[PDB]
Amino acid sequence: SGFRKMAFPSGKVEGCMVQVTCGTTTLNGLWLDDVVYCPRHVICTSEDMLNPNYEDLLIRKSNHNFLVQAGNVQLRVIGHSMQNCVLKLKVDTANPKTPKYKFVRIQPGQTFSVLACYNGSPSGVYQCAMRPNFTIKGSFLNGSCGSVGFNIDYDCVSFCYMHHMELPTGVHAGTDLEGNFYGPFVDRQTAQAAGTDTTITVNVLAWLYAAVINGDRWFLNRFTTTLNDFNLVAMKYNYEPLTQDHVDILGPLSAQTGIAVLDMCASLKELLQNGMNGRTILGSALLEDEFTPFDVVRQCSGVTFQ
Amino acid sequence: SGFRKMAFPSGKVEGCMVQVTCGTTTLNGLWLDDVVYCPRHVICTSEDMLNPNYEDLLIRKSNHNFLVQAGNVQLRVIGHSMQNCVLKLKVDTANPKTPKYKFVRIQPGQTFSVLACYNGSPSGVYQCAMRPNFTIKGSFLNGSCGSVGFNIDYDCVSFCYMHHMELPTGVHAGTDLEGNFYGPFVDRQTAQAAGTDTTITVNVLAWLYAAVINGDRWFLNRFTTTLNDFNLVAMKYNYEPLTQDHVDILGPLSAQTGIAVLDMCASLKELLQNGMNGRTILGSALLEDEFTPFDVVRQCSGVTFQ
Ligand SMILES: *[C@@](O)(c1nc(C(=O)OC)cs1)[C@H](C[C@@H]1CCNC1=O)NC(=O)[C@H](CC(C)C)NC(=O)[C@@H](NC(=O)OCc1ccccc1)C(C)C
Ligand SMILES: *[C@@](O)(c1nc(C(=O)OC)cs1)[C@H](C[C@@H]1CCNC1=O)NC(=O)[C@H](CC(C)C)NC(=O)[C@@H](NC(=O)OCc1ccccc1)C(C)C
């Protein structure tokens, strides 16, 4: 028992990280097979960033303008192209440590591990959710661009995120691995801001089940409710609406605990109206929304990768 | 910017994990050079656990009674011994992926990453502190014994923890890699309980500095205090005493922020007396104590490993 925010083991991804330099701009790249993927703004100076014309900046670049290092060894670039906001560099050597992999575009509410990197070297790993306003609450400094987020399924790494920028309030924005931004952000140093964020209700419900499983059940009350009634109160607290899909997804945790989803919704409702009155749940003094139902099941049944 | 609980990249340790079976008991082992280290209770049945005589259980075992698998391949055991509460199995092949490594015994307050494992396979990674009462707040199920905790310094892995047991309230106890328990616990299924835990004051102060660095400074007040005065109030809230060593350790964060340690102590004092009145600090609704000063510096300056 016990319940922790837990990242995937990072080894398979550590093997893919390289440093990419163009002129005096350095950041991280991801090396899979004979392609290196990185944020396109590697081709910019810090003046260029105010308002870059990426097609004009790029067209004046050739293969040899791109320095790719893996450890202390240089990779030879034999081709380049731009897809949306990522640059792809064809190199002459396949990554010998390429894992089985996929590229996916995740939905809001879905979680993933970030391997934060500097100069092609890993610094640490942590878990994030794609927020409803299409940002993530990360930890990123200058040089972290190109760090990636992923999930693992047994031996298969699904890359879902590449890091590009920080927005007001210290939240983060990036792309999928086809270089399409999550959210309506652009890779330019012009004033931009995320919209009001909401709470990922299905995830809060998953975490409450996690609590009951781990024996922390003081908040279970004697009421039930309906989906509509719940949703009315949800809306007022800037919680995302709960759908039939969400109910279905929570089916396994419902079954494991003997608590019907709608009964747990009534307990959450009461927490929203009354607060926690100084108590904690699974050590937290607020309602956590960055564990998916899948995250909870995985951690509560000890699923394993290789 | 942004501040996350962040584990070390796990790849170097993933390469060391094996499965160890004796009879029908399975758990994890750590393979370094030509030795595999694991909890000694691998040699017990679940009846034996109520009150095991480890010397008598062991002496009746030979090398061939120990099954060590790394992937789908069996390691040949050519020697065994017991050191405190760990078993060491000499095998005939050095781990080809052994990192540079050390064994260390950490102090209360120090943090480390856990690679939680089942059947010699990693399931995830998370950050823990050695609590003042010599437990950790982990996430561990049956089969997780032998999972290890570590720190990385550039390329050097310091193993500090091996997981053995869970105690009342869902907290965890284990050994250093010489098999000596943190705390006065024993590897027996007899009623045992940790003492009252306290808050790691120096770590809370580190985290407040992390907050100021990340621009969250609403809690800074206009008072100062003394170490004694602070300690008087600390004691009442079950905070560990602050020492001159602690002040010295916080020197770099003090310098980076321009806030004297004793001024920050006065802000903490006021948080302890008044609470946070519904506000959050770095997204938390309580005072976090599982970031060391070193943890904060590392994350705030992007230090990297390889
Ligand atoms: C990334 O690591 C790198 N960028 C460069 C670069 O641009 O080289 C010339 C090299 S590495 C960083 C990661 C950032 C730094 C701080 N935290 C992070 O996550 N990315 C950027 O520096 C990035 C470049 C974008 C424009 C593609 N710029 C930003 O993140 C900036 N955000 C921004 O310009 O938009 C928001 C905004 C709000 C308010 C006013 C103006 C802009 C921030 C401000 C650094
Ligand atoms: C470890 O993964 C394994 N143990 C065995 C084993 O004993 O084989 C026969 C194989 S793998 C587990 C990890 C535990 C399970 C639940 N969470 C964990 O962290 N360790 C144990 O099962 C362990 C064995 C000890 C005695 C060496 N036993 C315990 O953790 C038990 N704790 C205990 O007996 O002491 C506290 C106590 C409190 C109150 C009453 C009685 C005892 C718990 C109860 C499972």
XYZ file of N, CA and C in Angstrom, chain A residues 136-215:
240
model
N 0.973 22.137 -19.567
C 1.368 21.222 -18.535
C 2.057 22.058 -17.473
N 1.980 21.561 -16.246
C 2.682 22.094 -15.101
C 3.971 21.322 -14.957
N 4.990 21.804 -15.676
C 6.292 21.173 -15.638
C 7.300 21.885 -14.742
N 8.551 21.424 -14.910
C 9.743 22.036 -14.363
C 10.807 22.059 -15.457
N 11.029 23.248 -16.055
C 11.856 23.421 -17.240
C 12.614 24.757 -17.188
N 13.909 24.713 -17.489
C 14.749 25.905 -17.591
C 15.229 26.002 -19.036
N 15.890 27.114 -19.327
C 16.544 27.339 -20.601
C 17.447 26.134 -20.909
N 17.315 25.612 -22.122
C 18.077 24.466 -22.582
C 17.255 23.174 -22.559
N 16.052 23.241 -21.979
C 15.246 22.045 -21.784
C 14.404 21.737 -23.017
N 14.233 22.710 -23.910
C 13.550 22.434 -25.163
C 14.021 21.121 -25.778
N 13.045 20.378 -26.313
C 13.288 19.072 -26.915
C 13.215 17.901 -25.953
N 13.214 18.156 -24.630
C 12.857 17.119 -23.674
C 11.487 16.548 -24.076
N 11.283 15.261 -23.830
C 10.095 14.595 -24.342
C 9.293 13.965 -23.216
N 8.003 13.820 -23.484
C 7.108 13.098 -22.607
C 6.612 11.845 -23.300
N 6.369 10.803 -22.499
C 6.072 9.481 -23.014
C 5.250 8.634 -22.043
N 4.679 7.574 -22.615
C 4.166 6.447 -21.855
C 4.866 5.173 -22.321
N 4.912 4.174 -21.434
C 5.401 2.848 -21.808
C 4.263 1.831 -21.696
N 4.101 0.985 -22.726
C 3.237 -0.198 -22.676
C 4.065 -1.476 -22.896
N 4.395 -2.139 -21.783
C 5.285 -3.294 -21.729
C 6.687 -2.925 -22.237
N 6.917 -3.002 -23.547
C 8.238 -2.692 -24.072
C 8.169 -1.531 -25.071
N 6.950 -1.008 -25.300
C 6.694 -0.053 -26.369
C 6.595 1.365 -25.801
N 7.447 2.269 -26.284
C 7.420 3.653 -25.813
C 6.547 4.467 -26.747
N 5.487 5.090 -26.204
C 4.678 6.056 -26.934
C 5.114 7.457 -26.535
N 5.781 8.143 -27.460
C 6.076 9.557 -27.298
C 4.855 10.405 -27.614
N 4.502 11.320 -26.694
C 3.303 12.129 -26.845
C 3.616 13.629 -26.812
N 4.825 14.029 -26.378
C 5.082 15.431 -26.072
C 6.529 15.768 -26.380
N 6.745 16.972 -26.938
C 8.070 17.591 -26.992
C 7.968 19.034 -26.501
N 8.925 19.421 -25.654
C 8.829 20.642 -24.897
C 9.345 21.792 -25.746
N 8.602 22.921 -25.772
C 9.027 24.102 -26.526
C 9.070 25.402 -25.723
N 8.128 25.650 -24.818
C 8.078 26.993 -24.262
C 7.373 27.055 -22.914
N 7.597 28.172 -22.231
C 6.971 28.472 -20.961
C 6.066 29.688 -21.111
N 4.900 29.658 -20.476
C 3.940 30.737 -20.564
C 3.724 31.341 -19.191
N 2.957 32.464 -19.125
C 2.734 33.179 -17.872
C 2.125 32.249 -16.838
N 2.660 32.404 -15.626
C 2.344 31.626 -14.441
C 3.238 30.385 -14.382
N 4.302 30.296 -15.178
C 5.208 29.172 -15.040
C 4.564 27.847 -15.466
N 3.812 27.850 -16.571
C 3.304 26.620 -17.157
C 3.869 26.470 -18.562
N 3.708 25.276 -19.128
C 4.570 24.870 -20.219
C 3.695 24.438 -21.384
N 4.248 24.683 -22.563
C 3.606 24.332 -23.808
C 4.608 23.650 -24.748
N 4.047 22.711 -25.528
C 4.800 21.958 -26.501
C 3.931 21.240 -27.527
N 4.579 20.328 -28.267
C 4.022 19.738 -29.461
C 3.871 18.234 -29.255
N 3.108 17.615 -30.168
C 3.304 16.179 -30.390
C 4.577 15.986 -31.233
N 4.914 14.728 -31.506
C 6.133 14.428 -32.252
C 5.962 14.648 -33.760
N 4.762 15.048 -34.247
C 4.631 15.561 -35.609
C 4.742 17.085 -35.639
N 5.050 17.676 -34.480
C 5.334 19.090 -34.385
C 4.086 19.965 -34.305
N 2.914 19.379 -34.060
C 1.687 20.148 -33.864
C 1.477 20.475 -32.391
N 1.350 21.767 -32.077
C 1.161 22.216 -30.706
C -0.099 21.622 -30.115
N 0.008 21.246 -28.848
C -1.148 21.152 -27.979
C -1.580 22.575 -27.690
N -2.856 22.844 -27.958
C -3.419 24.155 -27.688
C -3.095 25.098 -28.840
N -3.599 26.339 -28.775
C -3.427 27.296 -29.852
C -2.205 28.197 -29.720
N -1.106 27.662 -29.195
C 0.103 28.434 -28.985
C 0.990 28.378 -30.222
N 1.884 29.370 -30.329
C 2.859 29.453 -31.406
C 4.266 29.622 -30.821
N 5.266 29.192 -31.609
C 6.667 29.185 -31.206
C 7.287 30.518 -31.597
N 6.853 31.541 -30.849
C 7.261 32.922 -31.009
C 7.231 33.591 -29.644
N 8.194 34.500 -29.422
C 8.263 35.280 -28.204
C 7.387 36.510 -28.378
N 6.086 36.257 -28.325
C 5.071 37.293 -28.299
C 4.119 36.910 -27.174
N 3.515 37.922 -26.524
C 2.607 37.722 -25.398
C 1.494 36.754 -25.793
N 1.388 35.716 -24.976
C 0.426 34.656 -25.140
C 0.057 34.203 -23.745
N -1.154 33.667 -23.599
C -1.563 33.167 -22.298
C -2.583 32.054 -22.497
N -2.471 31.064 -21.618
C -3.412 29.962 -21.526
C -4.732 30.479 -20.966
N -5.818 29.782 -21.281
C -7.116 30.053 -20.693
C -7.245 29.483 -19.281
N -8.370 29.799 -18.632
C -8.663 29.342 -17.280
C -8.625 27.829 -17.318
N -7.901 27.219 -16.378
C -7.812 25.777 -16.349
C -8.994 25.216 -15.553
N -9.298 23.945 -15.770
C -10.333 23.286 -14.992
C -9.765 22.013 -14.368
N -10.518 21.435 -13.420
C -10.099 20.202 -12.790
C -10.618 18.999 -13.575
N -9.744 17.988 -13.705
C -10.023 16.757 -14.441
C -10.783 15.788 -13.528
N -12.111 15.936 -13.544
C -13.002 15.256 -12.614
C -12.783 13.743 -12.601
N -12.696 13.129 -13.784
C -12.552 11.674 -13.824
C -11.294 11.276 -13.050
N -10.215 12.085 -13.129
C -8.962 11.768 -12.447
C -9.107 11.924 -10.932
N -9.875 12.923 -10.483
C -10.085 13.124 -9.058
C -10.824 11.894 -8.506
N -11.797 11.395 -9.264
C -12.568 10.222 -8.859
C -11.654 8.999 -8.797
N -10.758 8.841 -9.783
C -9.782 7.768 -9.728
C -8.937 7.828 -8.447
N -8.508 9.032 -8.083
C -7.654 9.206 -6.936
C -8.416 8.944 -5.638
N -9.694 9.299 -5.599
C -10.477 8.936 -4.430
C -10.586 7.421 -4.273
N -10.751 6.690 -5.367
C -10.762 5.240 -5.305
C -9.408 4.729 -4.805
N -8.324 5.344 -5.294
C -6.998 4.968 -4.842
C -6.906 5.091 -3.324
N -7.542 6.132 -2.777
C -7.530 6.392 -1.350
C -8.272 5.307 -0.590
N -9.422 4.882 -1.129
C -10.229 3.904 -0.440
C -9.459 2.599 -0.440
N -8.842 2.262 -1.585
C -8.041 1.057 -1.721
C -6.932 1.077 -0.673
N -6.310 2.246 -0.458
C -5.230 2.345 0.505
C -5.743 2.608 1.914
N -7.047 2.470 2.159
C -7.596 2.465 3.506
C -7.901 3.854 4.053
